[PDB]
Amino acid sequence: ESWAQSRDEQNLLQQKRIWESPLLLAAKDNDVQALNKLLKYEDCKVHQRGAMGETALHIAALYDNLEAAMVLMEAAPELVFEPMTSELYEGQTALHIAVVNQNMNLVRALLARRASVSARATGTAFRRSPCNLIYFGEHPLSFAACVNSEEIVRLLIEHGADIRAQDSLGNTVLHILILQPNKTFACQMYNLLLSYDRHGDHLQPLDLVPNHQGLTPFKLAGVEGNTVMFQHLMQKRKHTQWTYGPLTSTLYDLTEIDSSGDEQSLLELIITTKKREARQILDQTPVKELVSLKWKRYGRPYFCMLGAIYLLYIICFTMCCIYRPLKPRTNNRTSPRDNTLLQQKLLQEAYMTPKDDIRLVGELVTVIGAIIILLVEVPDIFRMGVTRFFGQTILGGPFHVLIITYAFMVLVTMVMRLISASGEVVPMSFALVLGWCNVMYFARGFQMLGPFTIMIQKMIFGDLMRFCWLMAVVILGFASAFYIIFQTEDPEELGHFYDYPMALFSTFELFLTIIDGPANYNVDLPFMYSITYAAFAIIATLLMLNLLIAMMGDTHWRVAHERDELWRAQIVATTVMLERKLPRCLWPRSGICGREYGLGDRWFLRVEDRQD
Amino acid sequence: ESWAQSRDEQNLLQQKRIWESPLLLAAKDNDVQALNKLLKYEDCKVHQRGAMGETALHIAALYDNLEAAMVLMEAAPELVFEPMTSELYEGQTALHIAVVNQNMNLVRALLARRASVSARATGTAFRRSPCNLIYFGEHPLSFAACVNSEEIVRLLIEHGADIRAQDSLGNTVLHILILQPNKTFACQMYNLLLSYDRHGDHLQPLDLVPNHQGLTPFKLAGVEGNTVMFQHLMQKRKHTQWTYGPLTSTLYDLTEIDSSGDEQSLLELIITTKKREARQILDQTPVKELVSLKWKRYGRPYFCMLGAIYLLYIICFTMCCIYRPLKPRTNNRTSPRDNTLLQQKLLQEAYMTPKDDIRLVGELVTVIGAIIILLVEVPDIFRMGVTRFFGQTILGGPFHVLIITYAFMVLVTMVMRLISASGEVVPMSFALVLGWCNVMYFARGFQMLGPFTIMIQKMIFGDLMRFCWLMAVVILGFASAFYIIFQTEDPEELGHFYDYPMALFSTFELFLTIIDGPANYNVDLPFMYSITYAAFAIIATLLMLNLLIAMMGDTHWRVAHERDELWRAQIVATTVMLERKLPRCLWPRSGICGREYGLGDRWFLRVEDRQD
Ligand SMILES: CCCCCCCC/C=C/CCCCCCCC(=O)O[C@@H](COC(=O)CCCCCCCCCCCCCCC)COP(=O)([O-])OCC[N+](C)(C)C
Ligand SMILES: CCCCCCCC/C=C/CCCCCCCC(=O)O[C@@H](COC(=O)CCCCCCCCCCCCCCC)COP(=O)([O-])OCC[N+](C)(C)C
Ligand SMILES: CCCCCCCC/C=C/CCCCCCCC(=O)O[C@@H](COC(=O)CCCCCCCCCCCCCCC)COP(=O)([O-])OCC[N+](C)(C)C
Ligand SMILES: CCCCCCCC/C=C\CCCCCCCC(=O)O[C@@H](COC(=O)CCCCCCCCCCCCCCC)COP(=O)([O-])OCC[N+](C)(C)C
Ligand SMILES: CCCCCCCC/C=C\CCCCCCCC(=O)O[C@@H](COC(=O)CCCCCCCCCCCCCCC)COP(=O)([O-])OCC[N+](C)(C)C
Ligand SMILES: CCCCCCCC/C=C\CCCCCCCC(=O)O[C@@H](COC(=O)CCCCCCCCCCCCCCC)COP(=O)([O-])OCC[N+](C)(C)C
Ligand SMILES: CCCCCCCC/C=C\CCCCCCCC(=O)O[C@@H](COC(=O)CCCCCCCCCCCCCCC)COP(=O)([O-])OCC[N+](C)(C)C
Ligand SMILES: CC(C)CCC[C@@H](C)[C@H]1CC[C@@H]2[C@H]3CC=C4C[C@H](OC(=O)CCC(=O)O)CC[C@]4(C)[C@@H]3CC[C@@]21C
Ligand SMILES: CC(C)CCC[C@@H](C)[C@H]1CC[C@@H]2[C@H]3CC=C4C[C@H](OC(=O)CCC(=O)O)CC[C@]4(C)[C@@H]3CC[C@@]21C
Ligand SMILES: CC(C)CCC[C@@H](C)[C@H]1CC[C@@H]2[C@H]3CC=C4C[C@H](OC(=O)CCC(=O)O)CC[C@]4(C)[C@@H]3CC[C@@]21C
Ligand SMILES: CC(C)CCC[C@@H](C)[C@H]1CC[C@@H]2[C@H]3CC=C4C[C@H](OC(=O)CCC(=O)O)CC[C@]4(C)[C@@H]3CC[C@@]21C
Ligand SMILES: CC(C)CCC[C@@H](C)[C@H]1CC[C@@H]2[C@H]3CC=C4C[C@H](OC(=O)CCC(=O)O)CC[C@]4(C)[C@@H]3CC[C@@]21C
Ligand SMILES: CC(C)CCC[C@@H](C)[C@H]1CC[C@@H]2[C@H]3CC=C4C[C@H](OC(=O)CCC(=O)O)CC[C@]4(C)[C@@H]3CC[C@@]21C
Ligand SMILES: O=c1c(-c2ccc(O)cc2)coc2cc(O)cc(O)c12
Ligand SMILES: O=c1c(-c2ccc(O)cc2)coc2cc(O)cc(O)c12
Ligand SMILES: [Zn+2]
């Protein structure tokens, strides 16, 4: 916005000041004879500051003018130690520019005059940001690795580059290559930089050194969805046991992958990333066999056991609403439109028989069970929802909004029972619907979990809610029309639209065709009704048929074209929740440990397969 | 047509008159034995103007006969200066014919005898028309460039042919190459014709010469959807500022692209054309970030401000119709089928209480708001086209008609209130439905409802005008059957078909299954009722299933795959509309004026990308 306008004016007044200054211009235009005349005129203003604090060496390096960049050196050798001074390109020297532009003959002549290989481009354009378009690090050795130039990397380290150097984000030169868009070229540069880590006394192998978020180069490849570097780093963690003809028993490490409770694991960090490429890591041969192992053995059976206890809680709540205390009414019927026969009992007369004491036991099971919902989930939606992730699990999305809304409605029914307020049917009727609609979500884990089952259910609900916005204006147009047509008529003969909230609810029902069209045949209806309702019935039929076709066309686009899994991240983030809630004695750790088989303290997973 | 019938007659009349004359036949069949004999007989009629006014030299050129064409030229050299004189081929010389046929040895012999390279073939088979298979221009350079003849366009320019000659449409040779089906050969011939503009002292260059519609070759590539010539002509408008490794900062021109405020810009021409491949130019590089810049900063805020003001205007109109002046009726009910209790107040009765004065404000808001609709949208719907430019504003413009018909219905209700006419429910009922269905227009300005409203609104008028004719045939056949069956019965029990306009409305409702099938069970219905209604129920089931299968084929399959491109084409069409009507004080001009940066008085767009 205001900042994007600021970058654009900054680049235009850069080119404006390179044209209105001759030594900046000849460095750009590679006018080698124009340098000799101006520099012999008593070295005029060789300490230039252009738009981005640039000197004339920065211009000559930027446009790959090797012949013009030489003349600046013998004229004043103090320009090779000069950075750019603006906020956007802060700290960038000429050695950074020639490395990114891959100018071989220039970068030797810079090192020939002792250019610092440990400079730090701290500017706002050299920071990881979606507004920035490249993130190449902060060091010249980091710039050489990202543009894929093997010969510069061998040249820079020879002059003393530090491969252990880190950024302001803590990323070393091996963290940055995982962030690069071309994966295959970054895979060759990874093997190169590890070969120069001879260094057996640095107390840490360099591909274990964490950034300021604690992530290793292994975990960062799992978070950023870099599947090419993930499979490359996994051969460091395999161990082939035997090969019996076509069979092979491979043993995987599972130290930085499986959860230990005290530390965030790779399975959790894929979920909170919310990226589309990070879910491809869940398809990989150590991780894919781990998720299906614990969602077959502990994760799924405990999911169905918690849903069976919730079903007994809602049945116990349902019985207390059916047998709610009611007495015949005390006052007389006011209007002839008053249908009410019964009313609620007061608190003193609610409990005076032994059959009410059986109900009182059931009413206390409900309230105690409603507090437990608040005591375990008011932490959860703070932890889960706004901090890490929301709506990408099974039992997920509008489950946690609704079951919190359930337990709120039960405690409202308790208050209205105590102060003997009228209208407890209103918090109960919400709580029956809210409570039983949550049972449909536990029914989602009774499935074999295909790749396009839960996301299609989530999709169809998403299109129906978009259809309800477009049909609200169609109802409001025709309900207002139907209201003023029958506004001069007698509602004893046709009372579908007798006041305006009823006319709105009738037109909603006629749209879905769940009540019949109004007709009497013993009296003359207005003529404007018949042509309006014939227009309404054609519109409502076509809009309901186009809804079905639009759900078919949107189903095809997300199965055949969007090509996103969604089905492994749902069973991961469900299994993470049940593992933090249950104690350790009910949850054995997946894999098998060492010290009785002699491999360490590490929890290995054996995978046996057939090559064919 | 008898036009195309008359064309085929003279194509056979041409072949007859050649086959009659021995001179014309020997030119055709390349019988040079007969050529020397017919000249030594007599200097005969070598100006035999046949059916389509041609000579023997034209026939030697049409059938590619080198030896026959030469003998005509030495015997009578005055035939090279002869055009065809009919209506279908007016002005075409023999030089036009040999150039299209690419008989390049004949081109040397014709240019030796100073054949006119500036003759204009102004025939009806040379104008641009959808009934002609060719549109190659009117000039021999225009004919040579479109058949991809590099050797003849080099030959004709050397012999004094004008490159900047125009048709009777203003099209130069550069315009016509854009109108050719082979885009690849059009680009190579385009570069060759600019290389012969070395003698530029003329006020406009060739690529900056408009036709009679004012379009340049760059704009005509935009209108016709020629994306191949569009990207190649955009290289002349670019200006690369710097290159930093994989980064590139390009600076686009935006002179013939952006809305200049006076002349119809390229964004306006692509929206208001009846084509489909022009909509791919909306995804080209300078155009895509231009309209994204306008929509994020000024398009979407202004569209949602107008959307919220319109919604409050319709709620104010709705409450003035709910509280419309009604009083109890004066006279008594005539028949026992009279249901009416109330009627309209008179004008002197309608405003007596202060509750009416609150309605009097909201009725003035409604009337004033309806005049503004007829002053923003009427003085551009006649001054920018009354017929078929009007119709272009209706094809992709179905909410222009709805909001103008709304504004007339509000003003009809005003006049009937002033003259105290009875029947205001008839203009109001149209105005309530047309008022609330225009809210669906503003659904395009949202990501969540954007592509989904495309799928819901799209319906085919080929298979739905088929259904609505086949629905009306079933209704007329079965309501007439249902009428005469119950014509001898008592309508007190079953009154669904008591007179013939009601039987049409009941069978319409039974076809859509929105009222129940008539039944009593306390009385004996006729036997023909059960036979007919069972046949009617199967036919109505059949035609509903025809409508579903028709809505699943070859158009909804395309809209499901193109819903995002169609939604962005609505964003561009809205942004163009809002930029014209809003003043320049609320809409700043897009780009950056390069006046204070030494670039001329132009507005530039700076685009930065990564080339990888
Ligand atoms: C009847 C009308 C009144 C209701 C209006 C309000 C209702 C909401 C309407 C809102 C406006 C209409 C737009 C559609 C809904 C959002 C768009 C969407 O993405 O759809 C999503 C629906 O949502 C889910 O099923 C997943 C859960 C995430 C969202 C949380 C819902 C809020 C809970 C409160 C709910 C109400 C309970 C409140 C009362 C207690 C799914 O779309 P998808 O992308 O195809 O799915 C792929 C999953 N993926 C995204 C992970 C890849
Ligand atoms: C999430 C997907 C769905 C979308 C949600 C919204 C869906 C719609 C939900 C609607 C919920 C209810 C809204 C209106 C309720 C008022 C009724 C009332 O009190 O009537 C009173 C009158 O007063 C009125 O009639 C005021 C209503 C007129 C304007 C309608 C409100 C516009 C909705 C805003 C949003 C729309 C925009 C949404 C689309 C952009 C009493 O009238 P009466 O008893 O008949 O007696 C009158 C006296 N007389 C006899 C002299 C005549
Ligand atoms: C592209 C899709 C759109 C198609 C449009 C179709 C929509 C239909 C448009 C309908 C127009 C609006 C409705 C009014 C029509 C009723 C006329 C009337 O007033 O009846 C009066 C006279 O009764 C008659 O004699 C009428 C007989 C048929 C004439 C009218 C339909 C034309 C038939 C051909 C159709 C042409 C169409 C060609 C094929 C489609 C009074 O009725 P009654 O009191 O019962 O009098 C009976 C007296 N009796 C008791 C002695 C017996
Ligand atoms: C696994 C799931 C799969 C599905 C299987 C489901 C399992 C089986 C499902 C249901 C069991 C079988 C049907 C029950 C019928 C009850 C007997 C009856 O007919 O009514 C009789 C009495 O009954 C009562 O009055 C009940 C009063 C409220 C009881 C609340 C539950 C207490 C449970 C305690 C804790 C539970 C622990 C739960 C938490 C862990 C007759 O009553 P009445 O004379 O007609 O009316 C007057 C009563 N009034 C005076 C109060 C108004
Ligand atoms: C004691 C507490 C329980 C503890 C149990 C401990 C062990 C539990 C362990 C495992 C339990 C489950 C193992 C069953 C075998 C799996 C088959 C399956 O999932 O069906 C199908 C899903 O269809 C469904 O949605 C459910 C089908 C079953 C009906 C309802 C189950 C019980 C509901 C309540 C009744 C009372 C039960 C609760 C009592 C209150 C499979 O679908 P699909 O074939 O893959 O379709 C793919 C098609 N596609 C590829 C095109 C997309
Ligand atoms: C997303 C947004 C949603 C929320 C939006 C709000 C939605 C809901 C809003 C309000 C709810 C509805 C009202 C509540 C019910 C009380 C009724 C009442 O007492 O009113 C009384 C007066 O009222 C009228 O006469 C009608 C009002 C005139 C239309 C609006 C005028 C305001 C103009 C300003 C325009 C501002 C700018 C406009 C735009 C540029 C009716 O009393 P009565 O006794 O029945 O009258 C009968 C008298 N008679 C018999 C002689 C006829
Ligand atoms: C009557 C009362 C109505 C309600 C009150 C109105 C509100 C106040 C009144 C007027 C002010 C209107 C908004 C002006 C300022 C906001 C503009 C803006 O900056 O864009 C913002 C959003 O913008 C929106 O989402 C607009 C939502 C407001 C409601 C639109 C009203 C029209 C609805 C009626 C017709 C339609 C329904 C049709 C139904 C068939 C930015 O866009 P973004 O997507 O957030 O960016 C991505 C976010 N990210 C960068 C972090 C990733
Ligand atoms: C004034 C009226 C409209 C009441 C407003 C409440 C409803 C808008 C919401 C509240 C929670 C309900 C939900 C409760 C649970 C269901 C199951 C559903 O998830 C499923 O298991 C079915 C699979 C699928 O989503 O397609 C998602 C929402 C739904 C239909 C409901 C949608 C609508 C309901 C009635
Ligand atoms: C599903 C598509 C076709 C429409 C989606 C719109 C719904 C989200 C809304 C708007 C229309 C409905 C409303 C229609 C009118 C009624 C009036 C109702 O108040 C009364 O019934 C009073 C009746 C009386 O006074 O006689 C409150 C909300 C309700 C059920 C509805 C609440 C929600 C509904 C389902
Ligand atoms: C009181 C009663 C008699 C009012 C009757 C309402 C009709 C006069 C209007 C109001 C809303 C409708 C319109 C709303 C929008 C559509 C778009 C449609 O197709 C298009 O123009 C392009 C497709 C698209 O919408 O994107 C043509 C007319 C149609 C069905 C409608 C034509 C007529 C309808 C039924
Ligand atoms: C006196 C008794 C009958 C009280 C009711 C039983 C409760 C002790 C249990 C069983 C049903 C409840 C559960 C209902 C559902 C949730 C989700 C949870 O599953 C997940 O964490 C995954 C959610 C997701 O992946 O989106 C399992 C337990 C929890 C919080 C609840 C924990 C405790 C509750 C209140
Ligand atoms: C007393 C005052 C405050 C009442 C408010 C008046 C507005 C409700 C109306 C008057 C005329 C305007 C409208 C004039 C025309 C346009 C375009 C739009 O219809 C189209 O022409 C686009 C249709 C298409 O391109 O397909 C509908 C509403 C809009 C933005 C305007 C919406 C709001 C406006 C300001
Ligand atoms: C292309 C679209 C418009 C659909 C094509 C079908 C409609 C043109 C026709 C088919 C039969 C219907 C008609 C059938 C009979 C009725 C009689 C009605 O006259 C009356 O007086 C009502 C009956 C009575 O009160 O006696 C006015 C027209 C109506 C609703 C209908 C008008 C339009 C309908 C939907
Ligand atoms: O059930 C249907 C049918 C349907 C299904 C089977 C038939 O034999 C006929 C219609 C058509 O459109 C719908 C459209 C809808 O929006 C919802 C539906 O349930 C249906
Ligand atoms: O035509 C469809 C569609 C379909 C897809 C996208 C659309 O826009 C419309 C229909 C989906 O599933 C089918 C499934 C079928 O067995 C047969 C079909 O013809 C279809
Ligand atoms: Zn497809």
Author numbering:
A (entry chain A), B (entry chain D): 27 to 638
Anything the authors wrote about it?
TRPV6 is a representative of the vanilloid subfamily of transient receptor potential (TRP) channels that serves as an entry gate for capturing dietary calcium ions in the gut1–3. In a nutshell, hTRPV6 is assembled of four subunits and contains a transmembrane domain (TMD) with a central ion channel pore and an intracellular skirt that is mostly built of ankyrin repeat domains connected by the three-stranded β-sheets, N-terminal helices, and C-terminal hooks. The TMD is composed of six transmembrane helices S1–S6 and a re-entrant pore loop (P-loop) between S5 and S6. As in all representatives of the tetrameric ion channel family, the ion-conducting pore of TRPV6 has two narrow regions, the selectivity filter formed by the extended regions of the P-loop and the gate formed by the S6 bundle crossing, separated by the central cavity in the middle.
The second, predominant population of particles yielded a 2.66-Å 3D reconstruction with no symmetry imposed (C1), which had two densities of the size of a genistein molecule that had never been seen in TRPV6 reconstructions before. Further analysis showed that this second reconstruction represents a genistein-bound inhibited state of the channel, hTRPV6GEN. In contrast to hTRPV6Open, the gate region in hTRPV6GEN is narrow and fully sealed by the side chains of L574 and M578. Overall, the structure is ~4-fold symmetrical but shows noticeable deviations from the 4-fold symmetry at the intracellular region of the ion channel pore, around the two putative sites of genistein binding. Close inspection of the hTRPV6GEN cryo-EM map revealed two densities of the shape of a genistein molecule at the intracellular half of the ion channel pore that were not present in the hTRPV6Open map. The upper site (1) is located above the gate, at the bottom of the central cavity, and is contributed by the S6 hydrophobic residues M570, L571 and L574. The bottom site (2) is right below the gate, at the intracellular entrance to the ion channel pore, and contributed by the residues M578, G579, H582, W583 and A586. Two strong densities at the pore intracellular entrance, located two-fold symmetrically relative to the central pore axis, are observed in the cryo-EM density of hTRPV6GEN. Each of these densities is in the middle of three-histidine clusters, which include H587 of the B/D diagonal subunits pair as well as H582 and H587 of the A/C diagonal subunits pair. When binding to the open TRPV6 channel perpendicularly to the central pore axis, genistein molecules pull one diagonal pair of subunits (A/C) asymmetrically towards the channel center.
